[PDB]
Design a binder for this molecule. Structure first.
Ligand code: HEM
Ligand SMILES: C[C@@H]1C=C(N)NCC1
Length: 292
């Protein structure tokens, strides 16, 4: 097992990272046309998850620490198709703040997107350090979408996530859309595509889902409202243990926010050793809170 010790960018503190957060948040507001006016929030959340989701608890390979998405093997992962849009969004931010590590930037993009979309506060820690190209994990560590509840449960054990953590994390599927050209799936998960709510769970329980084939010849569950669920999403109401948790989150917005915040921070920090004297996690103010 590799050890990755968090190392604070030299001399930086909360205020420096709040400036980076603010730059990301301002660009999120500015570049509003993207993806038929969804904006960049959802793709930034997906990027933060995919750079973290390569982690393997068994040997501490992959994970957000090394910023390895910047290397061709990882950014060309078929599982990452479309994330180049998020990377391009972050490029001017990195140019303005060249001192931030790549892993810190990609993970902070996800935190900023969740909060700016009115989601929960997500505490965030700095100190990821870029590692060399040979530390890039091979393709194939991110999950397939065509599988069942047992696949999802087993998959997430590798990321040290339990049933509650898995169901909470999947609530991010309220955001954005599937794009046929990226993933072979098409459509949004609900009405509020760029506002962070518990709608994923409500839609799973309340919509009338039909199992259909899309134009890429893949199965997905579709509702007459024009929403979709991946087979892996739908598995959360097929498995009785997942179903209980889906119902809980559909009925308690605050509980979902609190559990999502914990699981998402954990996801973004998997693989990182934080020294005992490392700074406490930062909680960034939103632009709205700052009057900006
Ligand atoms: C079983 C696990 C998962 C599977 C199989 C899966 C699969 C997918 C697929 C196929 C897409 C569509 C990509 C595209 O066509 O552009 C997508 C989108 C998305 N996923 Fe997941 N995902 C999983 C878990 C997660 C998790 C844990 C998160 C974050 C907490 C997440 C966040 C998102 C977001 C925000 C989008 C929308 C991206 C956009 O609008 O550009 N997903 N997911
Ligand atoms: C916006 C998309 C809706 C889902 N149900 N799953 C993937 C993300």
């Amino acid at each position: 097992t590799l050890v990755h010790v968090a190392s604070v960018e030299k001399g930086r503190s909360y205020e420096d990272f709040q400036k980076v957060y603010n730059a990301i948040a301002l660009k999120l507001r500015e570049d509003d046309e993207y993806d038929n006016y969804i904006g960049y929030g959802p793709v930034l959340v997906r990027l933060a998850w995919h750079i973290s989701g390569t982690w393997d608890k068994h040997d501490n390979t992959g994970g957000s620490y090394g910023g390895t998405y910047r290397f061709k093997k990882e950014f060309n992962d078929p599982s990452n198709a479309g994330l180049q849009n998020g990377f391009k969004f972050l490029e001017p931010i990195h140019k303005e703040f060249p001192w931030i590590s790549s892993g810190d930037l990609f993970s902070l993009g996800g935190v900023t997107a969740v909060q700016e979309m009115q989601g929960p506060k997500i505490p965030w820690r700095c100190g990821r350090v870029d590692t060399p190209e040979d530390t890039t994990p091979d393709n194939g560590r991110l999950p397939d979408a065509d599988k069942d509840a047992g696949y999802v449960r087993t998959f997430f054990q590798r990321l040290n996530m339990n049933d509650r953590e898995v169901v909470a994390l999947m609530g991010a599927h309220a955001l954005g859309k599937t794009h046929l050209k990226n993933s072979g799936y098409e459509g949004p998960g609900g009405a509020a595509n760029n506002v962070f709510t518990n709608e994923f769970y409500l839609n799973l329980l309340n919509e009338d889902w039909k199992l259909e084939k899309n134009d890429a010849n893949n199965e997905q569950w579709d509702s007459k409202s024009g929403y979709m669920m991946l087979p892996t999403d739908y598995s959360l109401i097929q498995d009785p243990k997942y179903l209980s948790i889906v119902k809980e989150y559909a009925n308690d917005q605050d509980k979902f926010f609190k559990d999502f915040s914990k699981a998402f921070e954990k996801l973004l920090e998997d693989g990182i050793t934080f020294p005992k004297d490392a700074p406490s996690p930062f909680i960034f103010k939103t632009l709205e809170e700052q009057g900006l």
